[PDB]
Amino acid sequence: SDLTFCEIILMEMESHDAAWPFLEPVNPRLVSGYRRIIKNPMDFSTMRERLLRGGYTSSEEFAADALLVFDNCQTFNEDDSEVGKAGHIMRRFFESRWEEFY
Numbered sequence: 658s659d660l661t662f663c664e665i666i667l668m669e670m671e672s673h674d675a676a677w678p679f680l681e682p683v684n685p686r687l688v689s690g691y692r693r694i695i696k697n698p699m700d701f702s703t704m705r706e707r708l709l710r711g712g713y714t715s716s717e718e719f720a721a722d723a724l725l726v727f728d729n730c731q732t733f734n735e736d737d738s739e740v741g742k743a744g745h746i747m748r749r750f751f752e753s754r755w756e757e758f759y
């Protein structure tokens with residue numbers, strides 16, 4: 658179905674130069690205040706596990722997780738911080754590739 662294009666997007670996100678903040682869950686023991694500020698953490702590796710398991714009913718639930726990744730990034734990180742700057746590049750990349758398939 659749709660979800661073949663989700664694998665293309667997820668694979669390209671996973672291998673993108675600016676993906677290093679999003680390849681694994683934020684470790685809250687290492688990031689002060691993260692556990693308190695971000696209610697629903699999300700990251701690329703969690704989406705890959707869900708997608709392999711087939712846990713995405715629609716291309717839209719996949720996109721909701723992807724946008725959750727970048728909403729969380731913008732909530733916690735200043736736009737001029739290193740993680741913030743990476744998040745912006747990754748978010749614009751996502752919605753660019755997303756618009757080219759849907």
Ligand SMILES: CC(=O)n1cc(-c2c(C)nn3c2OCC3)c2ccccc21
Nearest residue numbers: 678679681682683684688730733734740
């Ligand atoms: C997604 C996100 O907001 N963040 C991700 C990292 C992160 C991860 C997942 N790995 N490494 C990081 O910074 C160096 C190595 C991080 C760090 C500080 C503040 C916010 C952070």
Ligand SMILES: CC(=O)n1cc(-c2c(C)nn3c2OCC3)c2ccccc21
Nearest residue numbers: 678680681682683684685686687688689
């Ligand atoms: C998963 C995660 O959130 N993080 C991982 C590191 C990390 C690791 C796994 N190794 N080294 C690191 O920073 C020095 C060397 C890290 C650092 C700061 C903030 C968050 C971080």
